[PDB]
Amino acid sequence: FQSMKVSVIIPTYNERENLEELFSRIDNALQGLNYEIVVVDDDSPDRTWEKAQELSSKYPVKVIRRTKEKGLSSAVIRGFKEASGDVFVVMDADLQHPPEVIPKLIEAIKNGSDIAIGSRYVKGGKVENWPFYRKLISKGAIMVGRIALPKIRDIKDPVSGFFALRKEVVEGVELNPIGFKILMEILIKGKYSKVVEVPFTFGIRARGESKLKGKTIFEYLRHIYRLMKWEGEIDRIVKFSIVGLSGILVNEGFLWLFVNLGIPKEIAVIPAVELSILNNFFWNDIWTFKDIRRGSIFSRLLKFHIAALSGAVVNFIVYWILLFLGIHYLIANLVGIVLSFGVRYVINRHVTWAT
Numbered sequence: 001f002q003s004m005k006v007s008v009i010i011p012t013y014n015e016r017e018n019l020e021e022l023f024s025r026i027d028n029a030l031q032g033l034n035y036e037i038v039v040v041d042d043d044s045p046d047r048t049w050e051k052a053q054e055l056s057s058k059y060p061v062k063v064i065r066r067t068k069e070k071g072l073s074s075a076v077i078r079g080f081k082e083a084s085g086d087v088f089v090v091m092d093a094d095l096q097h098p099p100e101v102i103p104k105l106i107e108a109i110k111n112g113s114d115i116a117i118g119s120r121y122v123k124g125g126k127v128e129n130w131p132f133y134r135k136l137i138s139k140g141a142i143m144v145g146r147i148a149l150p151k152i153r154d155i156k157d158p159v160s161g162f163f164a165l166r167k168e169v170v171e172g173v174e175l176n177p178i179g180f181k182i183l184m185e186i187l188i189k190g191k192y193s194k195v196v197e198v199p200f201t202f203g204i205r206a207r208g209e210s211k212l213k214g215k216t217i218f219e220y221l222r223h224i225y226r227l228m229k230w231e232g233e234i235d236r237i238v239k240f241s242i243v244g245l246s247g248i249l250v251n252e253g254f255l256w257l258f259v260n261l262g263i264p265k266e267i268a269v270i271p272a273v274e275l276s277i278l279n280n281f282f283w284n285d286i287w288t289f290k291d292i293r294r295g296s297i298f299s300r301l302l303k304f305h306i307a308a309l310s311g312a313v314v315n316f317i318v319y320w321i322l323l324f325l326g327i328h329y330l331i332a333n334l335v336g337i338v339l340s341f342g343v344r345y346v347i348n349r350h351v352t353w354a355t
């Protein structure tokens with residue numbers, strides 16, 4: 001069936017010795033199929049391009065050398081432009097991504113998926129000779145993305161450099177050239193209705209230096225922020241804060257009104273805070289999250305109370321921990337309120353108004 005064309009897009013910087021092994025294993029994996037290899041090199045101080053062309057004698061290789069541009073994601077964007085296939089396959093050149101699982105990726109695509117992700121973290125997925133710490137940092141960084149970007153909440157390895165997609169997913173789509181995690185750009189901005197993750201083993205690099213470890217983490221966080229903006233999450237967070245501010249005023253307002261009407265201070269606090277919660281739910285339901293209301297309004301009201309209570313607990317615990325660590329009580333209090341707001345937003349975004 002793969003009379004349809006497959007383009008294997010490979011970004012390279014100083015990837016030399018690996019090419020011979022790479023192309024060999026790729027060809028054997030994709031034996032007899034209509035495929036091309038598209039190498040995108042940013043004028044390596046390295047011979048290859050050169051080695052690439054030479055294997056063009058034996059392998060269907062298209063070589064793109066760019067002198068004006070640098071960057072991993074930028075190269076992949078270039079690959080999409082230069083590729084002529086119906087299905088794109090993106091992978092590294094160092095054999096950490098095994099060419100032998102490419103058939104499973106394209107098979108998923110033929111079976112009806114728009115994107116097939118080579119994933120280290122779904123059932124079956126593994127990583128080879130990783131220290132436990134590095135594995136934590138990885139899944140920890142991934143967790144941040146899944147929570148901050150609800151669209152990829154259920155993706156286990158959204159930062160993978162190894163994936164396949166129908167050309168339709170990214171044609172007509174403007175992808176941001178900055179960064180490394182091109183898949184995350186695609187998951188957010190691409191056109192698709194079905195993604196699957198396919199387990200594989202992230203193997204040992206065989207030969208050559210590493211060019212990205214570690215130069216990725218704070219870029220990754222700025223990438224997340226750009227995507228939060230794009231998704232309207234930043235907008236929701238600002239509106240949520242504004243509502244939250246109004247709630248503080250409403251709380252103090254009723255507290256004053258109640259005690260001056262002959263109601264004891266430590267009795268008046270209860271209706272005052274509950275009214276502030278009701279106030280906060282109301283504006284968030286008709287403004288902040290108006291477009292993603294589901295089910296009964298009472299069910300949302302109850303979930304909102306859970307988030308509000310969770311916020312108060314986080315605020316309490318954070319404050320005292322910081323006080324025990326020797327932090328000034330005003331800073332401690334500030335951080336408590338900020339983390340409370342953060343937790344309340346996350347719980348309301350993922351539970352009260354879940355998507």
Ligand SMILES: Nc1nc2c(ncn2[C@@H]2O[C@H](COP(=O)(O)OP(=O)(O)O)[C@@H](O)[C@H]2O)c(=O)[nH]1
Pocket residue numbers: 011012013014015040041042070071072075091092093094096205209210211212213
């Ligand atoms: N074209 C291009 N390729 C890059 C760039 N940075 C990294 N790569 C390629 O991306 C692939 C994976 O990079 P690698 O160093 O193995 O990342 P690591 O697995 O985290 O160590 C390799 O084939 C590199 O050649 C870049 O700036 N431009």
Ligand SMILES: CCCCCCCCCCCC[N+](C)(C)[O-]
Pocket residue numbers: 144148221222224225
């Ligand atoms: C879960 C939140 C992700 C952390 C965001 C890290 C990037 C912050 C730097 C981007 C600059 C933001 N700003 C407001 C100055 O434009």
Ligand SMILES: CCCCCCCCCCCC[N+](C)(C)[O-]
Pocket residue numbers: 242245
């Ligand atoms: C807390 C200071 C920040 C200023 C924001 C004050 C609330 C702005 C509400 C604008 C919404 C009005 N409108 C018509 C768009 O619904």
Ligand SMILES: CCCCCCCCCCCC[N+](C)(C)[O-]
Pocket residue numbers: 242243245246249283286287
């Ligand atoms: C469809 C209308 C959307 C609601 C308009 C904006 C509601 C903001 C109400 C809270 C702001 C109160 N305060 C004190 C900050 O001005």
Ligand SMILES: CCCCCCCCCCCC[N+](C)(C)[O-]
Pocket residue numbers: 247248251273276277280308309312
């Ligand atoms: C059964 C005891 C309940 C203790 C929990 C107290 C909840 C405090 C909620 C504070 C939120 C008020 N405000 C103005 C920030 O919305």
Ligand SMILES: CCCCCCCCCCCC[N+](C)(C)[O-]
Pocket residue numbers: 250253254256257
């Ligand atoms: C919705 C509750 C608000 C009702 C009226 C609130 C009156 C505002 C407080 C007036 C001044 C209070 N204080 C302590 C500064 O004197």
Ligand SMILES: CCCCCCCCCCCC[N+](C)(C)[O-]
Pocket residue numbers: 269270273274312315
């Ligand atoms: C931010 C937490 C500090 C709030 C101070 C007042 C707390 C008094 C108990 C509030 C109980 C809230 N509610 C609605 C569950 O009753």
Ligand SMILES: CCCCCCCCCCCC[N+](C)(C)[O-]
Pocket residue numbers: 317320321
């Ligand atoms: C991991 C949860 C941390 C619990 C924080 C414990 C707070 C202890 C505060 C003690 C000071 C208050 N007081 C009035 C009893 O002195």
Ligand SMILES: [Cl-]
Pocket residue numbers: 244247280308344
């Ligand atoms: Cl709230």
Ligand SMILES: [Mg+2]
Pocket residue numbers: 092094096205210
């Ligand atoms: Mg590598």
